[PDB]
C-alpha cells in the first residue's frame, strides 16, 4: 500500500508519485488510509497528519517518510547544544568550525530583555565576552546586526516605537567573510542540501545542491542556481566544498544518535529527508546554519525542478522499494555518484 495523504496540488507530487510508480507499479497508491482503521503500508504525508502510534507500535506493518522524535537536529536550540557536546567529546572534528552558534529568547512584551537575557545564561556570556567575537544577528522568528549586549539593548528599544507583539527571537553569529561572485553581481548566497535517512540508520547526502542568492549585493540575477552549475567556482574547490558538506553531515548526524537517544531517534520502519543549509566563506569554507525537516522543495524553481525529481527518484529507489522487495536488495544495490551513503549502522 502507498498512502499519499499530502495534497495533489503540492510541489513534490509529480516527482514523488512518478517515482512511486516507476519502482512500485504492482503496489497501489491510495490517498486516505483511515478506511482499514496486518500487512505492508508505506505512507508519505505531512508530520502533523501522520499516524505515530501505528508506526512505533506496528513496525513491520507501517512505514513512513518521517521519524517521530527528531528535535535534536531540526530545532535550533537543541541543534546548538548537540554540536557543542559532540565537540566537547571529539574536538578533532570540523563541526565546531562549521557551526554558526544560534540561541533563542522568550521575550514577553512587558518583561525586560535583561531578564530574558539572564533567562539564557548560555547566551548572556557569548554576548558578554566580545574580544574579536563574531558580529551577532537577531531573527524575529527585523533582521539586525550588533556586538554588545548594550548594542542589542538599543535594538530592542526600537521595536515598540516601530509598531513588538512578538515573543520568540533567534540570535546567531553573522560572519562578514562570505563569497561574493562577480558573475552574480556579488549577491550574497547560501547553499541548500538534501540529506536522506533510511531507518536505524543510513545517511545519504544528495550531491546535486542549490545555491540561493539574496537579490541585494550588500546589506547577475538568477535567484536559484544548482551550485554544481557555478562556472565561477573552480571544480577542484567546488568538490572540496562538497567534501566539507559530506563531513559536516557525517559528524552532525551521528552527533545526535550518540548525544541523547530520547531527543533524536530513528525508526527501522521509516525514512527521513532534511534541508541542510550552509554558507561558503571567502577562504572557501562551508559553515552550516540549520537542518530542517519537511523542507520547502518549491524553493528550487519550476526550471530546476528535475533537481527534485532525481532526489525523489533516489528516495523511492533507496527507501520505499525495500519495504516490498527481497533481503538480497542490500548487496544487489549499486552506489549512485550523486547519492553518497555517508553513514551505515546496525539498529539499537
Amino acid at each position: 500500500l502507498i498512502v499519499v495523504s499530502i495534497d495533489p496540488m503540492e510541489y513534490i507530487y509529480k516527482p514523488l508519485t512518478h517515482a512511486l510508480k516507476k519502482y512500485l507499479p504492482q503496489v497501489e497508491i491510495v490517498s486516505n488510509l483511515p478506511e482499514f482503521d496486518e500487512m505492508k503500508v508505506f505512507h508519505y504525508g505531512d508530520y502533523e497528519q501522520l499516524d505515530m502510534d501505528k508506526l512505533m507500535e506496528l513496525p513491520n506493518n507501517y512505514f513512513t517518510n518521517s521519524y517521530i522524535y527528531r528535535k535534536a537536529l531540526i530545532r535550533k536550540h537543541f541543534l546548538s547544544h548537540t554540536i557543542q557536546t559532540y565537540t566537547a567529546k571529539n574536538p578533532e572534528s570540523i563541526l565546531k568550525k562549521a557551526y554558526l552558534e544560534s540561541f533563542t529568547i522568550d521575550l514577553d512584551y512587558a518583561e525586560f530583555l535583561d531578564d530574558a537575557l539572564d533567562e539564557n545564561w548560555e547566551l548572556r556570556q557569548e554576548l558578554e565576552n566580545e574580544s574579536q567575537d563574531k558580529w551577532w544577528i537577531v531573527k524575529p522568528s527585523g533582521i539586525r546586526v550588533f556586538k554588545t549586549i548594550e548594542d542589542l539593548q538599543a535594538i530592542f528599544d526600537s521595536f515598540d516605537d516601530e509598531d513588538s507583539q512578538l515573543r520568540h527571537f533567534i540570535i546567531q553569529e553573522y560572519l562578514t567573510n562570505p563569497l561574493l561572485l562577480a558573475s552574480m553581481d556579488n549577491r550574497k548566497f547560501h547553499i541548500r542540501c538534501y540529506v536522506v535517512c533510511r531507518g536505524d540508520l543510513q545517511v545519504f547526502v544528495y550531491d546535486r545542491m542549490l545555491a540561493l542568492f539574496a537579490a541585494k549585493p550588500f546589506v547577475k540575477d538568477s535567484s536559484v542556481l544548482e551550485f554544481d552549475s557555478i562556472e565561477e567556482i573552480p571544480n577542484e574547490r567546488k568538490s572540496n566544498i562538497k567534501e566539507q558538506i559530506h563531513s559536516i553531515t557525517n559528524d552532525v548526524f551521528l552527533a545526535a544518535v550518540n548525544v541523547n537517544r530520547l531527543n533524536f531517534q530513528p525508526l527501522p520502519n521509516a525514512f527521513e529527508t532534511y534541508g541542510v543549509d550552509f554558507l561558503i566563506d571567502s577562504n572557501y569554507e562551508v559553515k552550516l546554519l540549520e537542518i530542517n525537516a519537511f523542507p520547502d522543495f518549491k524553493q528550487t524553481g519550476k526550471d530546476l525542478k528535475n533537481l527534485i525529481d532525481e532526489l525523489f527518484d533516489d528516495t523511492v529507489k533507496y527507501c520505499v522499494t525495500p519495504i516490498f522487495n527481497e533481503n538480497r536488495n542490500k548487496t544487489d544495490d549499486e552506489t549512485d555518484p550523486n547519492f553518497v551513503k555517508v553513514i551505515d549502522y546496525t539498529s539499537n
Binding site: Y47, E48, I68, K71, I74, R75, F294
Partner: peptide, 8 residues
C-alpha cells in the same frame, strides 16, 4: 510543537 513548525 517541538517536532513540527505547524501552528495548532
Amino acid at each position: 510543537g517541538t517536532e513540527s513548525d505547524s501552528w495548532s
